Design an enzyme around this catalytic site. Structure first.
Site, PDB file in Angstrom:
ATOM      1  NE  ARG A   1       6.259   6.663  28.358  1.00  0.00           N
ATOM      2  CZ  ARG A   1       4.991   6.353  28.594  1.00  0.00           C
ATOM      3  NH1 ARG A   1       4.708   5.236  29.283  1.00  0.00           N
ATOM      4  NH2 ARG A   1       4.037   7.224  28.281  1.00  0.00           N
TER       5      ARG A   1
ATOM      6  NE  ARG B   1       3.615   0.609  31.483  1.00  0.00           N
ATOM      7  CZ  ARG B   1       2.872   1.581  30.994  1.00  0.00           C
ATOM      8  NH1 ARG B   1       3.205   2.806  31.305  1.00  0.00           N
ATOM      9  NH2 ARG B   1       1.873   1.357  30.162  1.00  0.00           N
TER      10      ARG B   1
ATOM     11  CE  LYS C   1      -1.101   2.657  32.031  1.00  0.00           C
ATOM     12  NZ  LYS C   1      -0.952   4.039  31.338  1.00  0.00           N
TER      13      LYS C   1
ATOM     14  CE  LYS D   1       1.952   4.585  35.377  1.00  0.00           C
ATOM     15  NZ  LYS D   1       1.398   5.920  35.083  1.00  0.00           N
TER      16      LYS D   1
ATOM     17  CB  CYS E   1      -0.050  15.250  30.038  1.00  0.00           C
ATOM     18  SG  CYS E   1      -1.589  15.801  29.242  1.00  0.00           S
TER      19      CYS E   1
ATOM     20  CB  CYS F   1      -1.906  12.471  23.509  1.00  0.00           C
ATOM     21  SG  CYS F   1      -2.640  11.269  24.629  1.00  0.00           S
TER      22      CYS F   1
ATOM     23  CB  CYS G   1      -7.902  13.052  28.281  1.00  0.00           C
ATOM     24  SG  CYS G   1      -6.926  11.595  28.744  1.00  0.00           S
TER      25      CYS G   1
ATOM     26  CB  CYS H   1      -0.269  11.768  31.886  1.00  0.00           C
ATOM     27  SG  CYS H   1      -1.079  10.373  30.978  1.00  0.00           S
TER      28      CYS H   1
HETATM   29  C1  SRM Z   1       4.755  11.447  29.085  1.00  0.00           C
HETATM   30  C2  SRM Z   1       3.779  11.197  30.240  1.00  0.00           C
HETATM   31  C3  SRM Z   1       3.144  12.532  30.712  1.00  0.00           C
HETATM   32  C4  SRM Z   1       4.177  13.626  31.044  1.00  0.00           C
HETATM   33  O1  SRM Z   1       3.936  14.798  30.785  1.00  0.00           O
HETATM   34  O2  SRM Z   1       5.280  13.360  31.529  1.00  0.00           O
HETATM   35  C5  SRM Z   1       2.609  10.338  29.888  1.00  0.00           C
HETATM   36  C6  SRM Z   1       2.021  10.404  28.581  1.00  0.00           C
HETATM   37  C7  SRM Z   1       1.083   9.377  28.097  1.00  0.00           C
HETATM   38  N1  SRM Z   1       0.382   8.558  28.890  1.00  0.00           N
HETATM   39 FE1  SRM Z   1       0.446   8.480  30.961  1.00  0.00          FE
HETATM   40  N2  SRM Z   1       2.122   9.652  30.909  1.00  0.00           N
HETATM   41  C8  SRM Z   1       3.009   9.876  31.900  1.00  0.00           C
HETATM   42  C9  SRM Z   1       2.743   9.436  33.245  1.00  0.00           C
HETATM   43  C10 SRM Z   1       1.391   9.126  33.789  1.00  0.00           C
HETATM   44  C11 SRM Z   1       1.072   9.127  35.157  1.00  0.00           C
HETATM   45  C12 SRM Z   1       1.880   9.739  36.284  1.00  0.00           C
HETATM   46  C13 SRM Z   1       2.615   8.802  37.139  1.00  0.00           C
HETATM   47  O3  SRM Z   1       2.763   7.670  36.686  1.00  0.00           O
HETATM   48  O4  SRM Z   1       2.987   9.233  38.232  1.00  0.00           O
HETATM   49  C14 SRM Z   1      -0.305   8.630  35.197  1.00  0.00           C
HETATM   50  C15 SRM Z   1      -1.210   8.543  36.409  1.00  0.00           C
HETATM   51  C16 SRM Z   1      -0.858   7.427  37.403  1.00  0.00           C
HETATM   52  C17 SRM Z   1      -1.743   6.316  36.954  1.00  0.00           C
HETATM   53  O5  SRM Z   1      -1.275   5.548  36.105  1.00  0.00           O
HETATM   54  O6  SRM Z   1      -2.903   6.226  37.426  1.00  0.00           O
HETATM   55  C18 SRM Z   1      -0.582   8.320  33.855  1.00  0.00           C
HETATM   56  C19 SRM Z   1      -1.848   7.769  33.344  1.00  0.00           C
HETATM   57  C20 SRM Z   1      -2.137   7.162  32.004  1.00  0.00           C
HETATM   58  C21 SRM Z   1      -3.290   6.489  31.630  1.00  0.00           C
HETATM   59  C22 SRM Z   1      -4.424   6.029  32.527  1.00  0.00           C
HETATM   60  C23 SRM Z   1      -3.940   4.741  33.194  1.00  0.00           C
HETATM   61  C24 SRM Z   1      -5.033   4.033  33.970  1.00  0.00           C
HETATM   62  O7  SRM Z   1      -4.729   2.939  34.504  1.00  0.00           O
HETATM   63  O8  SRM Z   1      -6.192   4.511  34.011  1.00  0.00           O
HETATM   64  C25 SRM Z   1      -3.126   6.188  30.285  1.00  0.00           C
HETATM   65  C26 SRM Z   1      -4.109   5.491  29.383  1.00  0.00           C
HETATM   66  C27 SRM Z   1      -4.066   3.999  29.461  1.00  0.00           C
HETATM   67  O9  SRM Z   1      -3.041   3.448  29.918  1.00  0.00           O
HETATM   68  O10 SRM Z   1      -5.064   3.412  29.037  1.00  0.00           O
HETATM   69  C28 SRM Z   1      -1.939   6.818  29.917  1.00  0.00           C
HETATM   70  C29 SRM Z   1      -1.294   6.781  28.581  1.00  0.00           C
HETATM   71  C30 SRM Z   1      -0.336   7.755  28.070  1.00  0.00           C
HETATM   72  C31 SRM Z   1      -0.088   7.929  26.588  1.00  0.00           C
HETATM   73  C32 SRM Z   1       0.927   6.796  26.313  1.00  0.00           C
HETATM   74  C33 SRM Z   1      -1.309   7.927  25.672  1.00  0.00           C
HETATM   75  C34 SRM Z   1      -1.565   6.542  25.062  1.00  0.00           C
HETATM   76  O11 SRM Z   1      -2.036   5.632  25.790  1.00  0.00           O
HETATM   77  O12 SRM Z   1      -1.282   6.307  23.870  1.00  0.00           O
HETATM   78  C35 SRM Z   1       0.762   9.155  26.706  1.00  0.00           C
HETATM   79  C36 SRM Z   1       1.422   9.739  25.478  1.00  0.00           C
HETATM   80  C37 SRM Z   1       1.354  11.258  25.279  1.00  0.00           C
HETATM   81  C38 SRM Z   1       2.380  11.661  24.220  1.00  0.00           C
HETATM   82  O13 SRM Z   1       1.993  12.085  23.120  1.00  0.00           O
HETATM   83  O14 SRM Z   1       3.601  11.601  24.456  1.00  0.00           O
HETATM   84  N3  SRM Z   1      -1.324   7.375  30.972  1.00  0.00           N
HETATM   85  N4  SRM Z   1       0.441   8.547  33.025  1.00  0.00           N
HETATM   86  C39 SRM Z   1       4.221  10.709  31.578  1.00  0.00           C
HETATM   87  C40 SRM Z   1       4.986   9.400  31.156  1.00  0.00           C
HETATM   88  C41 SRM Z   1       5.533   8.565  32.368  1.00  0.00           C
HETATM   89  C42 SRM Z   1       6.518   7.430  32.059  1.00  0.00           C
HETATM   90  O15 SRM Z   1       7.654   7.696  31.662  1.00  0.00           O
HETATM   91  O16 SRM Z   1       6.265   6.224  32.247  1.00  0.00           O
HETATM   92  S1  SF4 Z   2      -3.555  12.871  30.487  1.00  0.00           S
HETATM   93 FE1  SF4 Z   2      -4.675  12.179  28.605  1.00  0.00          FE
HETATM   94  S2  SF4 Z   2      -4.168  13.859  27.101  1.00  0.00           S
HETATM   95 FE2  SF4 Z   2      -2.575  13.898  28.683  1.00  0.00          FE
HETATM   96  S3  SF4 Z   2      -0.868  12.571  27.835  1.00  0.00           S
HETATM   97 FE3  SF4 Z   2      -2.177  11.385  29.317  1.00  0.00          FE
HETATM   98  S4  SF4 Z   2      -3.540  10.262  27.914  1.00  0.00           S
HETATM   99 FE4  SF4 Z   2      -2.753  12.064  26.697  1.00  0.00          FE
END
Ligand code: SRM
Ligand code: SF4
Ligand code: FES
Ligand SMILES: [Mg+2]
Lengths: 567, 96
Positions: A62, A131, A214, A216, A432, A438, A478, A482
């Site tokens: 990424r 991030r 993280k 943001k 996502c 994932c 889930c 994201c």
């Molecule tokens: C690619 C992306 C989704 C998309 O369709 O674009 C993404 C995909 C993943 N996210 Fe995310 N997140 C992505 C933005 C988001 C956002 C949106 C935003 O930031 O505006 C959120 C919600 C905002 C937030 O953080 O509350 C988000 C909330 C999470 C979470 C829950 C975080 C939390 O604090 O609860 C995780 C899980 C974790 O970190 O434990 C997670 C973790 C992941 C993981 C890395 C799964 C993992 O932990 O191993 C993802 C990989 C999926 C894959 O196979 O590629 N991702 N994730 C977006 C990547 C953004 C980036 O470049 O940095």
């Molecule tokens: S919302 Fe859940 S299923 Fe979708 S990319 Fe984020 S961690 Fe994976």
């Protein structure tokens, strides 16, 4: 009590060990400590969950791209890398970055060094770190848009890890040529006037333990909510003078999507208005906020580590007072702002400097096949810089008027359509990646959303809703959120092998937080819920009332009754 | 193949029939049987049980190390029956 990750961080020598030794072992995977550490260097080990009874390991990378800006040179490298070392696709993300999936461990160093050496970075794309910092993706030359973008870039710079493990691992400690950071950033980073820094540490801001989780940040100009500002840890809004000259920033704090099913103590949250600072103060205020989280965010249980929880616990006034101790002065009162508007930046538009930009609609950010090949030909032929949008779209920047026709033609031959030729439901939909790579997915998202959109349009037609009408649909596999489904007019959040939790109450401009409406709706059953909701919307909405506004006005009691009463 | 899955819960013995392509948790819930969970992605201790007889395919899981699986612990959200199996559920605290 400290989580396992705090100890791994503690014992890593600033993110080097044992990642350093694991990267060169003959195994196709790396050990648990290295799995956790490599996230900081912008890579995630993954396994392909479509192949069962056997673990096929691969790594996703990424990038870091403040404001979503991607230089031509970096675009060409990423495109080539996806085909030579990946699985042939690039994935545009909801934070304006690329992901590249499917890289074997043995090629991983080759690929990150290539990125590093072609104007890119993956540093802190994952990890307990700042991030990608969001900003308006459109390449407008308007003063305050430019200023939002520069501000985002300085914040990303301010919060970049300084320990050197990154270049140490991936380019063997080579010097890599980059443009100099503005003196403003260096000076803010170094300031310890208010006890924010560890001045003897290799990480003067992050320290040994980095952040609890993280972090943001999103930056924008008044009115432009393409960044989904309210979901961020910090939202930063440019405030201008009447003549258009930036004078300061409004700041919000404490948003976040992450929650866990059945753990009602976890929840999505909107960021609160904190206050205003004059423009010169911004990097000082931002550090003050990050340091408050660094010092106070929970490190015992990672479910409660985000800044949103400390703000929920403390209340915004006590939070502000704590932040001001590190800023060394008081916030001014938050200044009134106009109403938010969502902007896709799609289609043909003017930069303001004589050139055009074109926003390319991409379903789910997935760039592959002929579309990938065509975009690379265009971007290479015209030497375009590009920009990634927070809706997983791509903007082609800097286009001469005379190139409009040839580009439009080439994009159409690849099936990359102009917004007028796309269902409005697609234009505002996100999902996502979820399965198959994932590790956290409970169900499909990217791989099931497009048949769901077609199903929603079929319900609209059956109800008699016009085909220009739409709602924002966001799907995750889930509840981590994201694709920001808790801001959607219609969110589907994976909650079983083929079932979703439905959320309602988000609005077209992402100004409101959705609420859980029904749990465990089976994929097969989605029309039993939707048809009655959209019948009631069509039958009773006020003139031009969006589904989300309608939802919030009528309320869940009546909505569940309409659904109940259908069945 | 479908197997007899006997769940030893703090409330009683419930006996269910689960396909070898269906996670034990998934089938249980589908019947009406309330079992603990959180992440449902084999990445935690929420759904932890103990295998007391029989076997499972839990190779999708990631939380438990090889020692803990050898000791008969199971993440029920990420476990396919491979035989008739008795599982003591609600063992997260025990683990943990
Ligand atoms: C690619 C992306 C989704 C998309 O369709 O674009 C993404 C995909 C993943 N996210 Fe995310 N997140 C992505 C933005 C988001 C956002 C949106 C935003 O930031 O505006 C959120 C919600 C905002 C937030 O953080 O509350 C988000 C909330 C999470 C979470 C829950 C975080 C939390 O604090 O609860 C995780 C899980 C974790 O970190 O434990 C997670 C973790 C992941 C993981 C890395 C799964 C993992 O932990 O191993 C993802 C990989 C999926 C894959 O196979 O590629 N991702 N994730 C977006 C990547 C953004 C980036 O470049 O940095
Ligand atoms: S919302 Fe859940 S299923 Fe979708 S990319 Fe984020 S961690 Fe994976
Ligand atoms: S619920 Fe998290 S491991 Fe099964
Ligand atoms: Mg899109």
């Amino acid at each position: 009590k400290r989580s396992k990750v705090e100890i791994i961080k503690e014992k890593s020598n600033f993110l080097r060990y044992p990642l350093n030794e694991e990267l060169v072992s003959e195994a196709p995977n790396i050990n648990e400590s290295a799995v956790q550490l490599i996230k900081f260097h912008g890579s995630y080990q993954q396994t392909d969950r479509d192949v069962r009874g056997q673990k096929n390991y691969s790594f996703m990378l990424r990038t870091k791209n403040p404001c979503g800006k991607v230089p031509n040179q970096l675009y060409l490298a990423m495109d080539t890398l996806a085909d030579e070392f990946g699985i042939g696709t690039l994935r545009l993300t909801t934070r304006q970055t690329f992901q590249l999936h499917g890289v074997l461990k043995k090629n991983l160093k080759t690929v990150l060094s290539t990125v590093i050496k072609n104007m890119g970075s993956t540093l802190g794309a994952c990890g307990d770190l700042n991030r990608n910092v969001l900003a308006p993706a459109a390449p407008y030359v308007k003063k305050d848009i430019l200023f939002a973008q520069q501000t985002a870039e300085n914040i990303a710079a301010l919060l970049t890890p300084q320990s050197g493990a990154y270049y140490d691992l991936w380019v063997d400690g080579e010097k890599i040529m980059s443009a100099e950071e503005p003196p403003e950033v260096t000076k803010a980073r170094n300031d310890n006037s208010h006890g924010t820094n560890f001045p003897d540490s290799p990480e003067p801001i992050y320290g040994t333990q980095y952040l609890p989780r993280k972090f943001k940040v999103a930056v924008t100009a008044a009115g432009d909510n393409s960044v989904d500002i309210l979901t961020n840890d910090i939202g930063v809004v440019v405030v201008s003078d009447d003549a258009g000259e930036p004078i300061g920033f409004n700041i919000y704090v404490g948003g976040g999507m992450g929650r866990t099913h059945r753990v009602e103590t976890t929840f999505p949250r909107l960021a609160d208005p904190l206050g205003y600072v004059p423009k010169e103060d911004i990097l000082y205020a931002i550090k003050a906020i990050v340091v408050t989280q660094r010092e106070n965010g929970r490190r015992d249980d990672r479910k409660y580590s985000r800044m949103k929880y400390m703000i929920d616990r403390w209340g915004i006034d006590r939070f502000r007072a704590e932040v001001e101790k590190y800023y060394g002065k008081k916030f001014e009162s938050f200044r009134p702002l106009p109403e938010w508007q969502f902007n896709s930046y799609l289609g043909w538009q003017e930069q303001g400097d004589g050139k055009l930009f074109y926003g390319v609609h991409v379903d789910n950010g997935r760039v592959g096949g002929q579309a990938k090949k065509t975009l690379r030909e265009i971007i290479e032929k015209y030497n375009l810089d590009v920009s990634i949008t927070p809706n997983q779209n791509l903007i082609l920047c800097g286009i001469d008027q005379a190139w409009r026709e040839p580009i439009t033609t080439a994009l159409a031959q690849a099936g990359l359509l102009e917004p007028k030729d796309v269902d409005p439901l697609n234009l505002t939909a996100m999902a996502c990646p979820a399965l198959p790579l994932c590790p956290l997915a409970q169900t499909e998202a990217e791989r099931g959303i497009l048949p769901i959109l077609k199903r929603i349009r079929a319900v609209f037609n059956k109800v008699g809703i016009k085909d220009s009408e739409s709602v924002v649909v966001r799907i995750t596999g889930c509840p981590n959120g994201c694709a920001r489904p808790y801001m959607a007019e219609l969110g589907f959040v994976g909650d079983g092998p083929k079932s979703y939790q439905i959320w309602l109450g988000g609005t077209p401009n992402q100004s409101t937080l959705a609420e859980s409406f029904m749990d465990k709706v089976k994929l097969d059953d989605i029309e039993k819920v939707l048809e009655p909701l959209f019948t009631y919307w069509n039958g009773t909405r006020q003139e031009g009332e969006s589904f989300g506004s309608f939802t919030n006005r009528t309320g869940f009691d009546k909505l569940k009754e309409v659904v109940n009463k259908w069945a | 193949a479908t197997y007899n899955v006997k769940l030893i819960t703090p409330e009683g013995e419930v006996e269910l029939q689960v396909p070898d392509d269906v996670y034990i948790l998934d089938q249980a819930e589908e019947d009406g049987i309330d079992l603990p969970y959180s992440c449902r992605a084999g990445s935690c201790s929420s759904c932890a049980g103990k295998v007391v007889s029989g076997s499972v395919d839990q190779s999708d899981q990631s939380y438990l190390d090889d020692g803990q699986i050898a000791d008969g612990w199971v993440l029920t959200c990420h476990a396919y029956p491979t035989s008739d199996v008795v599982i003591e559920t609600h063992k997260e605290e025990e683990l943990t």
